[PDB]
Motif scaffolding. Structure first.
Motif, PDB file in Angstrom:
ATOM      1  N   UNK A 126       8.935   1.217  -4.943  1.00 27.97           N
ATOM      2  CA  UNK A 126       8.671  -0.015  -4.210  1.00 27.97           C
ATOM      3  C   UNK A 126       8.091   0.280  -2.832  1.00 27.97           C
ATOM      4  N   UNK A 127       8.648   1.269  -2.131  1.00 27.48           N
ATOM      5  CA  UNK A 127       8.123   1.621  -0.818  1.00 27.48           C
ATOM      6  C   UNK A 127       6.694   2.133  -0.918  1.00 27.48           C
ATOM      7  N   UNK A 128       6.413   2.967  -1.920  1.00 27.52           N
ATOM      8  CA  UNK A 128       5.062   3.493  -2.066  1.00 27.52           C
ATOM      9  C   UNK A 128       4.071   2.374  -2.345  1.00 27.52           C
ATOM     10  N   UNK A 129       4.448   1.421  -3.197  1.00 27.99           N
ATOM     11  CA  UNK A 129       3.571   0.288  -3.458  1.00 27.99           C
ATOM     12  C   UNK A 129       3.319  -0.517  -2.190  1.00 27.99           C
ATOM     13  N   UNK A 130       4.374  -0.788  -1.421  1.00 29.63           N
ATOM     14  CA  UNK A 130       4.212  -1.583  -0.210  1.00 29.63           C
ATOM     15  C   UNK A 130       3.263  -0.902   0.766  1.00 29.63           C
ATOM     16  N   UNK A 131       3.432   0.404   0.970  1.00 31.33           N
ATOM     17  CA  UNK A 131       2.579   1.062   1.953  1.00 31.33           C
ATOM     18  C   UNK A 131       1.156   1.233   1.440  1.00 31.33           C
ATOM     19  N   UNK A 175       2.427  -7.735  -9.434  1.00 28.63           N
ATOM     20  CA  UNK A 175       1.587  -8.088  -8.291  1.00 28.63           C
ATOM     21  C   UNK A 175       0.770  -6.893  -7.820  1.00 28.63           C
ATOM     22  N   UNK A 176       1.397  -5.719  -7.748  1.00 30.51           N
ATOM     23  CA  UNK A 176       0.678  -4.526  -7.313  1.00 30.51           C
ATOM     24  C   UNK A 176      -0.458  -4.193  -8.270  1.00 30.51           C
ATOM     25  N   UNK A 177      -0.202  -4.284  -9.575  1.00 29.14           N
ATOM     26  CA  UNK A 177      -1.247  -3.983 -10.546  1.00 29.14           C
ATOM     27  C   UNK A 177      -2.410  -4.953 -10.413  1.00 29.14           C
ATOM     28  N   UNK A 178      -2.119  -6.240 -10.220  1.00 34.42           N
ATOM     29  CA  UNK A 178      -3.199  -7.207 -10.048  1.00 34.42           C
ATOM     30  C   UNK A 178      -4.014  -6.908  -8.797  1.00 34.42           C
ATOM     31  N   UNK A 179      -3.348  -6.575  -7.689  1.00 39.12           N
ATOM     32  CA  UNK A 179      -4.090  -6.269  -6.470  1.00 39.12           C
ATOM     33  C   UNK A 179      -4.994  -5.063  -6.687  1.00 39.12           C
ATOM     34  N   UNK A 180      -4.474  -4.022  -7.336  1.00 38.90           N
ATOM     35  CA  UNK A 180      -5.281  -2.827  -7.552  1.00 38.90           C
ATOM     36  C   UNK A 180      -6.471  -3.128  -8.450  1.00 38.90           C
ATOM     37  N   UNK A 181      -6.260  -3.930  -9.495  1.00 34.11           N
ATOM     38  CA  UNK A 181      -7.368  -4.298 -10.369  1.00 34.11           C
ATOM     39  C   UNK A 181      -8.427  -5.084  -9.610  1.00 34.11           C
ATOM     40  N   UNK A 182      -8.006  -6.001  -8.738  1.00 34.20           N
ATOM     41  CA  UNK A 182      -8.975  -6.722  -7.918  1.00 34.20           C
ATOM     42  C   UNK A 182      -9.771  -5.765  -7.048  1.00 34.20           C
ATOM     43  N   UNK A 183      -9.094  -4.801  -6.428  1.00 32.01           N
ATOM     44  CA  UNK A 183      -9.790  -3.859  -5.557  1.00 32.01           C
ATOM     45  C   UNK A 183     -10.813  -3.064  -6.354  1.00 32.01           C
ATOM     46  N   UNK A 184     -10.467  -2.687  -7.584  1.00 32.30           N
ATOM     47  CA  UNK A 184     -11.350  -1.839  -8.363  1.00 32.30           C
ATOM     48  C   UNK A 184     -12.556  -2.545  -8.943  1.00 32.30           C
ATOM     49  N   UNK A 185     -12.583  -3.874  -8.908  1.00 25.52           N
ATOM     50  CA  UNK A 185     -13.632  -4.649  -9.558  1.00 25.52           C
ATOM     51  C   UNK A 185     -14.690  -5.173  -8.597  1.00 25.52           C
ATOM     52  N   UNK A 186     -14.648  -4.798  -7.319  1.00 29.80           N
ATOM     53  CA  UNK A 186     -15.563  -5.405  -6.359  1.00 29.80           C
ATOM     54  C   UNK A 186     -17.021  -5.076  -6.649  1.00 29.80           C
ATOM     55  N   UNK A 187     -17.303  -3.926  -7.251  1.00 26.72           N
ATOM     56  CA  UNK A 187     -18.675  -3.564  -7.547  1.00 26.72           C
ATOM     57  C   UNK A 187     -19.326  -4.513  -8.531  1.00 26.72           C
ATOM     58  N   UNK A 188     -18.583  -4.890  -9.571  1.00 28.71           N
ATOM     59  CA  UNK A 188     -19.129  -5.802 -10.570  1.00 28.71           C
ATOM     60  C   UNK A 188     -19.408  -7.159  -9.945  1.00 28.71           C
ATOM     61  N   UNK A 189     -18.489  -7.647  -9.113  1.00 26.40           N
ATOM     62  CA  UNK A 189     -18.702  -8.938  -8.469  1.00 26.40           C
ATOM     63  C   UNK A 189     -19.918  -8.877  -7.559  1.00 26.40           C
ATOM     64  N   UNK A 190     -20.109  -7.753  -6.869  1.00 27.15           N
ATOM     65  CA  UNK A 190     -21.281  -7.620  -6.010  1.00 27.15           C
ATOM     66  C   UNK A 190     -22.565  -7.678  -6.821  1.00 27.15           C
ATOM     67  N   UNK A 191     -22.610  -6.943  -7.932  1.00 27.91           N
ATOM     68  CA  UNK A 191     -23.805  -6.972  -8.766  1.00 27.91           C
ATOM     69  C   UNK A 191     -24.050  -8.374  -9.305  1.00 27.91           C
ATOM     70  N   UNK A 192     -22.981  -9.083  -9.670  1.00 28.96           N
ATOM     71  CA  UNK A 192     -23.139 -10.447 -10.160  1.00 28.96           C
ATOM     72  C   UNK A 192     -23.717 -11.350  -9.084  1.00 28.96           C
TER      73      UNK A 192
END
Lengths: 104, 104
Positions: A3-8, B14-31
């Motif tokens: 949890x701490x690693x995710x938060x940071x 929530x963490x997984x969703x945030x990471x997936x959003x971060x990883x997809x910015x290139x596709x959105x830019x190309x779109x």
């Protein structure tokens, strides 16, 4: 621990995005200056190579600006047409009144 | 224990969703680049294969852009038509006035 690693990690991403905006504040400035002079082809071309700008919503603001410019021009043209139409109507009515009075 | 594990699962999602959003910015830019150039056929095809971006509300923004393009074109055509109509009306009025004056 997880949890701490995710938060940071999330905090680090937020900080990186903020720093990116601060560093990009200059390109947005140049685009704002360019888009208020009517030049719209030199804004869509800098927003295609120097992209990955943090906020991709500036596009809507610049499009709104150019639309406002076009709308202003069209409104001016419409008013110019309307006044001439009024002058023509006045002239025609004056002639018609003279003719009708003579006939009566 | 049940409450703690439920909270931990929610945080992980929530963490997984945030990471997936971060990883997809290139596709959105190309779109965004593709949709700003009028090409509205390739945007749909890309958003059909990779369809699973963390936010399915980008489609609304892209459709708004396309509608703006079409509206701009139609407004320009309408302005041209109105100008031509006024040009015709001026000549018609001039001829009618001359004829009426001669008749009087």
């Amino acid at each position: 621990q997880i949890s701490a690693q995710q938060n940071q990690a999330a905090a680090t991403q937020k900080f990186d995005d903020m720093q990116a905006e601060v560093g990009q504040r200059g390109i947005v400035d140049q685009l704002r200056t360019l888009s208020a002079e009517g030049r719209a082809g030199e804004v869509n071309q800098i927003l295609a190579e120097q992209q990955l700008i943090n906020e991709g919503e500036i596009r809507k603001e610049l499009t709104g600006v150019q639309d406002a410019i076009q709308n202003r021009q069209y409104r001016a043209a419409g008013e110019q047409r309307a006044q001439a139409a009024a002058n023509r109507a006045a002239e025609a009515h004056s002639l018609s009144m003279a003719a009708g009075r003579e006939n009566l």
